[PDB]
Structure 1
Amino acid sequence: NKKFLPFQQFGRDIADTTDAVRDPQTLEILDITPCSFGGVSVITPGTNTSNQVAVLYQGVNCTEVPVAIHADQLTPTWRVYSTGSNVFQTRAGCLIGAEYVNNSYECDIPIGAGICASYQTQSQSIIAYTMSLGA
């Protein structure tokens, strides 16, 4: 929506980054954003115990991670997590492959925003919950 001046052609932001450009034909200033990307983290309970892992995409809402894996061309072993089998959106991006219980416990494997993940035998799996300070 931000307006230009009749002579003004394209916008720039601090640290010489291009943000918005006026189209030559319609003379309307459209906004340009860098393509989606991020970092991946692997939540693991230990090789000796189990082989079930959770994945964490940092700093992004993951309504678009299945397409991210489709374009990045990772194996269907990654596409299974790209599909929303078990998706939870925390403050630190989102985690895929972990059920979110509604009770509280202590913390063993940190993630962020005061949310932890741990392996529990009920139906052994990788649960994810909210930190509890103590009794």
Structure 2
Amino acid sequence: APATVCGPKLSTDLIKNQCVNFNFNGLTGTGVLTPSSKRFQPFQQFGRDVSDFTDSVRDPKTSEILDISPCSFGGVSVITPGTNASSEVAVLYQDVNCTDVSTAIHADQLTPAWRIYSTGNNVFQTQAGCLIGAEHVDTSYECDIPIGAGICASYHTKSIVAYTMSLGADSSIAYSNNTIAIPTNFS
């Protein structure tokens, strides 16, 4: 219900900023405070969505209705070509929205937390995630290293090339009512 005992800590101000260790009345979780359009009849003040985890909270001070997204996790995948071929930079995956990544590598919010990682220069939003070290190239060769959602990574001009893949090679044969093509030779 609306709470009585505090066991007093000083209450800070809430922020829309991603990744806040939120401590409401009985929720020592962590995540992204974000205002939401959820209705909340006044005798309920925790929101749940499909399962165990609290999705949305009405704030105890200001009665503002806000939903919680978690700290934007995912798996890190890493493209490499041959280490004998090149020890040049393994380009990476963050399976996350990209601006949540770029605004957290310039600060220290990631915790695989690579040290000599002043990269990146390149940023995608391709459905598989967001490549960082890989370069967008408009041409389209063949799938070399699979990524997800139609793009494949490779090792061409020697940088690492990200590109939507061309399926084999585009071809052309002319349908005609009269001409047949039959082989004269075989291999």
- Does 2:140 align with 1:104? yes
Q: Which consecutive residues of structure 2, in runs of 5 or more, have no partner in the other structure?
A: 1-36, 170-187
State the superposition RMSD in angstroms: 1.8
Higher relative strand content = 1
- Report the CA distance shift for 1:73/1:12 in structure 2 as closer, same or farther (over 3 A): closer
SS in 2 for 1:39: coil
Give the counterpart of 1:10 among 46, 61, 70: 46
Corresponding letter in the other structure for 1:57: Q
Cα distance in structure 2, aligned partners of 1:16 and 1:73: 27
Q: What is the CA-CA distance between 1:88 and the residue it aligns to? A: 2.0
SS in 1 for 2:69: coil
- Report the CA distance shift for 1:15/1:73 in structure 2 as closer, same or farther (over 3 A): closer
1:77-134 deviation digits (Å, cap 9, x = unpaired): 23x12xx4122221111001111111111111111111111111x3x11111111112
Corresponding letter in the other structure for 2:57: V
- Report the CA distance shift for 1:64/1:28 in structure 2 as closer, same or farther (over 3 A): closer
Give the counterpart of 2:113 among 74, 77, 85: 74
Higher relative helix content = 1
Provide the TM-score with structure 1 as the length reference: 0.84
SS in 1 for 2:47: strand
Residue 78 of structure 2 corresponds to 42
The number of residues matched between the two structures is 129
Cα distance in structure 2, aligned partners of 1:27 and 1:104: 53
| Conserved? CA contact 2:98–2:124, under 8 Å | no
- Identical-residue share of aligned pairs (%): 67
Provide the TM-score with structure 2 as the length reference: 0.63
Residue 85 of structure 1 corresponds to 121
For the pair shown, the structure with the greater C-alpha radius of gyration is: 2
Which moved further from structure 2: 60-69 or 15-24?
A: 60-69
Cα distance in structure 1, aligned partners of 2:126 and 2:97: 9
Q: What is the CA-CA distance between 1:49 and the residue it aligns to? A: 0.7
